[PDB]
Amino acid sequence: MDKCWFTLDNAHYPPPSLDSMRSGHPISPASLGHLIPSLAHLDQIINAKAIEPFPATMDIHGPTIIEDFKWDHSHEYSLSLGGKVPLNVGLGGAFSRSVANYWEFDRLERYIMQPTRSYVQKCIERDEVKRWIAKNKSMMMMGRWEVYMITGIIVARGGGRKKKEKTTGKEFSVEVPGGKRNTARQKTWGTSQTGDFVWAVRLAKITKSGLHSDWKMETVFGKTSSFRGQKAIF
Amino acid sequence: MDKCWFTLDNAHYPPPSLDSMRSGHPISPASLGHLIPSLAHLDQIINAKAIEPFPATMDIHGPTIIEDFKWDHSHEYSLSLGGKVPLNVGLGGAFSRSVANYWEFDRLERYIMQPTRSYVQKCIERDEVKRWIAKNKSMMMMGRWEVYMITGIIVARGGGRKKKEKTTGKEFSVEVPGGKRNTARQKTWGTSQTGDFVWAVRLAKITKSGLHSDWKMETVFGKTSSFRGQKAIF
Amino acid sequence: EEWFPLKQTHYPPPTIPSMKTGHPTGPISIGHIIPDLRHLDNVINCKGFEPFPPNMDVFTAHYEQCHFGDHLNSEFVVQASAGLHHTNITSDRWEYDSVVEYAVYPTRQYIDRLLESKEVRQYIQKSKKLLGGWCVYMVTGIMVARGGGRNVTSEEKGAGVSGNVGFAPEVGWDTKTKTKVNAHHTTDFVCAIRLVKIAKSGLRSSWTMKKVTR
Amino acid sequence: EEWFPLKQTHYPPPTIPSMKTGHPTGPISIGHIIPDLRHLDNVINCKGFEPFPPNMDVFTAHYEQCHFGDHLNSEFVVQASAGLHHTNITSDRWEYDSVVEYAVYPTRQYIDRLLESKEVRQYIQKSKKLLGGWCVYMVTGIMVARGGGRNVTSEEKGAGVSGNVGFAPEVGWDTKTKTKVNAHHTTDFVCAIRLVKIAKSGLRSSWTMKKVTR
């Protein structure tokens, strides 16, 4: 799935202005109309500062505002294993990791646009995109292009308070003679971010198996196709 | 059965006016003089905006007013079964469903008319009705027409407060090894409807086995002939 | 039964001037003929009827602070390899404020001339053609409330069936239904009516008039 | 089901003047055609649609103090040489302030002339060429909140797997996830929609229109 908003790990991107985003000015790397190979490669924008003009049928809809956004997430797990081989030797290994996140924000602002078949086809016919797909050299991906287009952006207006706690407990015991060692680490990071900056982005996956098939597009739900992709927050 | 008032599941129908209903203006789909195949198909009006004029012998009687109408209905049931087959495997399946409704209304207004033999015969001789009965193509219903005519309408004046609660508990246990799973869901819906709108309608069933037999009419009591027809409230 | 109470409130009362003019202004009035109690809305003499002769007159009665409450308990229990428990509990209460009762008495000649009406004669011919002996009912008196009255209804239906099969499956169904309805009517309506049965069969010289009690 | 609630708030409501002008000003409005519920953002008739005929009209309803709360418990337990315990606890609460509902009813001729649109006819030709029988959905009504509403979400997922191998290693995984989200929206958005299914297969003379309930 239901949530399709992926949060960014970098907060130094300035927020685009309404006139700039209407004119398609790429002031920040994260902006509407950009094409990226993956979410983790946002800085690798395929478009070379050539944004297709928005036709009269394209609208940015409205600034959906969210107030008093406070969410808490504690993700803790603990694994243990025991390997005993005969003489008799026993091994006990325990690994506990707890990650507790606590975020509070005052105002979030949503902007969203709906891509059309004609607009995407115009974008995919650009020379830069043709060069980029020509860079592909493999047989399994015989014309298989997997590019993500930035479709929606939500911007935080006023910063927010972040708290992160990480507990790591590693207990390793070997009984033969015998040696046991415990390594307990507890890291904390409290912050009060101040300033206006983009908070999260929504991307629509565009895929095309080959020239014989038709290129399809769909909004990404759940987690991205990248390795260990972070799940959508909300 | 004694009660012959069926409540509607849609509340967006505007209430007809006294002058409009006298003139037979079909402002709303639910109005006097309309013919419907069934209660669930109220939007499928047989009449094509051609209401037979009311003769001098036809009256709408009077606006019977009901005040402080509060009714509570809790319908809960629980079924269970156990299937054990030998080796020995036992299965326990329980299903509990509870539906609690609570309605409060301030003012309800009743309008009712009494159909006559001549008026119904005039209506049944219309070309639209003849076309509709000609659409029937079967041998069991050799001229068998089952149409419902709207005879009475009760209109709520001031909205009302509605509360609905639905509890569903499904417990499924299998003992072999063994797996048991419980799914408990509890949905709530509280509402305060505001505005004037039609509340319920009374229909008179008209049936005719064939041309050899005479067409008969009778007010429907209890539940309608449709599948899983809702019983009359009051 | 003396009177048959109607469990309906969608029938406005006739006005006094139109009560005895031969053309009633209400759905139910003295002088109508109905095929049966269930088919109460199928008035045979919809057009009207002859005006009451000067000998005919209506007798009126008045009642105040009239209330009517009744209860009902039904426990159908079957014990055996199955168990059935059907419990019905019904409670009804009516509290009126003012009640008026109008009554009349028929006459042989008046009923005979009433049977000569176009709608009445058409129905009796159809009934005779279809059925061997015809029978109709005529409304004699009506009881009318004034200003409505409070109504409280409480219904409780509990059905429990437990069936044991002996692989020994068991089926247990336990359903319960509750309904509490409170109503405050604020308009006049017809409460109860009296019916006179007119029947004729076996090629009788004259029809037979009888009274019906619950 | 009557309505399908949307778990999305990035869709602004259309304005009243543009509701029935044939050119909506919002992402979702009455008169759009979508391939499926999941592909809700792929509006086939993006350019527009024919204006509503004078016979067509929109019916409006109003609601105040509307709230909706639900819970869910799922306990998948497997006991045996392994033990699995999957416990899911979900809680959702929506507290609105004012809700408006718009509904319409289609007509055979209006849908037929809608199918003659350039984008609609292109899609149906592609679907017929690819699939044996085509099927589409049309949005009929929309429910719009006013001023937003408070939302509280509480999710708890606990998965515990203990596997015993018999050198007799044992593996024990115990993961827990908690998520509590509080939101206070302060803008209008689309809550729920009604979908009408239009399908045709087997070389039918005319297409079939049906309703979809959850």
XYZ file of C-alpha atoms in Angstrom, chain B residues 2 4-5 57 61-62 64-82 84-85 110 112 114 202 218-219 221, chain C residues 7-12 26-27 38-39 41-42 47 167-187:
68
model
C -46.957 -7.529 9.628
C -44.001 -4.141 4.918
C -41.391 -1.361 4.740
C -59.721 9.179 -7.453
C -53.311 10.453 1.605
C -51.455 12.333 4.367
C -47.845 10.458 8.654
C -45.057 11.790 10.883
C -42.918 9.672 13.224
C -40.751 11.324 15.881
C -37.921 10.038 18.088
C -37.331 6.820 16.142
C -34.545 4.872 17.874
C -34.048 1.163 17.204
C -31.262 -1.231 18.207
C -30.535 -4.570 16.520
C -27.774 -6.987 17.539
C -27.532 -10.083 15.326
C -24.814 -12.464 16.524
C -24.262 -16.142 15.781
C -21.503 -18.698 16.273
C -21.013 -21.992 14.434
C -18.449 -24.682 15.200
C -17.590 -28.089 13.772
C -15.086 -30.839 14.457
C -11.623 -36.079 13.172
C -10.402 -38.837 10.840
C -44.777 8.833 5.331
C -48.727 6.362 0.566
C -53.515 2.971 -3.165
C -43.025 0.107 0.085
C -50.462 -7.699 -3.619
C -48.382 -5.741 -1.128
C -44.957 -8.649 3.445
C -50.632 -3.333 13.001
C -50.302 -0.544 10.424
C -50.015 3.260 10.784
C -49.894 4.289 7.069
C -53.709 4.777 6.982
C -54.882 8.380 7.742
C -59.521 7.954 3.477
C -58.013 4.577 2.590
C -54.975 -9.806 4.442
C -56.000 -8.079 1.201
C -55.795 -2.555 0.579
C -57.874 -4.048 -2.275
C -65.419 4.466 -6.728
C -15.317 -39.921 11.979
C -17.816 -38.294 14.365
C -18.556 -34.753 13.156
C -20.537 -32.370 15.350
C -22.477 -29.312 14.165
C -23.380 -26.507 16.551
C -25.421 -23.481 15.462
C -26.280 -20.770 18.007
C -28.003 -17.660 16.633
C -29.563 -14.794 18.582
C -31.557 -11.773 17.415
C -32.550 -8.711 19.446
C -34.728 -5.817 18.290
C -35.897 -2.878 20.415
C -37.939 -0.232 18.588
C -39.190 2.993 20.181
C -41.672 5.153 18.271
C -43.531 8.380 19.108
C -46.318 8.981 16.602
C -47.829 12.474 16.482
C -50.684 12.057 14.002
